[PDB]
Amino acid sequence: GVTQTPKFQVLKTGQSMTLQCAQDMNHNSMYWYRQDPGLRLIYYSASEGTTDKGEVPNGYNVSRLNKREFSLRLESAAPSQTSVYFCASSEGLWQVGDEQYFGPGTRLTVTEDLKNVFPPEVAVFEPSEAEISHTQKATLVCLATGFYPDHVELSWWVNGKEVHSGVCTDPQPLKEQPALNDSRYALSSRLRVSATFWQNPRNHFRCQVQFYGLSENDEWTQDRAKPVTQIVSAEAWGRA
Amino acid sequence: KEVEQDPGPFNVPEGATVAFNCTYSNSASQSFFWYRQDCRKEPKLLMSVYSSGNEDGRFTAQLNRASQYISLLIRDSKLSDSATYLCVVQPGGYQKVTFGTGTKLQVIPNIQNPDPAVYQLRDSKSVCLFTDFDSQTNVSQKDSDVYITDKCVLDMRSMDFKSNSAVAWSNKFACANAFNNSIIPEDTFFPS
Incomplete structure (x- = not known):
């Protein structure tokens, strides 16, 4: 349209x-x-x-x-x-x-200053054994941290397929320093599966954060990596 | 700035009826609309509003020109109805269309068997997961080195099972104390 x-x-x-x-x-x-x-x-x-x-x-x-x-x-x-x-x-x-x-x-x-732009760090936190024992369910958590601006898209991929069932993503990235105008941001999502699903070592859980940043055109002089539009993933594998 | 709508945000149990109202100052106003806008997304027409009254499925809208208000009724609320609803007025003569600030709707599911627990998860260092708490527990924002997320509903569709969770993390810190500013039900499970 x-x-x-x-x-x-x-x-x-x-x-x-x-x-x-x-x-x-x-x-x-x-x-x-x-x-x-x-x-x-x-x-x-x-x-x-x-x-x-x-x-x-x-x-x-x-x-x-x-x-x-x-x-x-x-x-x-x-x-x-x-x-x-x-x-x-x-x-x-x-x-x-x-x-x-x-x-x-x-x-x-x-x-x-474009030096304030940062891609996210991305990590996957594995289900608690206590949750698995108590509930026969397993909740993964993905964290995207340290990014600016707050221009990210988070999705979950299980065994090469994008999933929505069992997924919750915060509606909004939170400010790590709410007072600051150049605060970096954080976003969490959960993905919950059955215990036996998690306990299958062949199952592959991938959190995928699309970040939008500087273009190719933009000039970079800083010692660290040019914070371009990019995808960052973090992964976990099943464990019995 | 002269369309006024419900302040919000509004909590409505899943399946229950929700009602929105909006006043507008200009009585020569010609056309009326409800828009719906999802978080991080663009507004979309929900329906046109007439003195006639208007029904599409679960959605009823009414215009009352004599009293200068429009309404929206949603029956059998779905989780997918969660959004902001904008009153929209086309004055028709000398003024631009006005979009209201919007009323934020949050459709809340019933958790039949609360199992409130706080788990610690490790990096494939660590985060804390508060979960399986009932829909009327409130998760609070106090420590600047402690990050706490709002409540989020996930839907395990194949198991027809909904559950609330909130994530907390810190660089400073134990899960036992991560969600203290929230009224946590006693007997919340805290694993060995």
């Missing part, structure tokens, strides 16, 4: 960037919103040839290129523009009952 690129982005203060948005629904009207911990209209485009400021236009620019595409531009990013950005479209904002379809959104983080 409504596509947005990129889905994730970390910028240095003062850098520029454009968020791209496309609808294949032949709508006239398109919008750009930001959402902060609701929705505020940045700018809108009522039809192909025109654009107009929304509630919070300061710091942004937009092109209505063609009927199909509506770009949002951040001239020079400021920390305050850290936010979730949603593109939307509608058949025509002048009609009674006009319905808006949202794009998936773009989580954008602005920091003073």
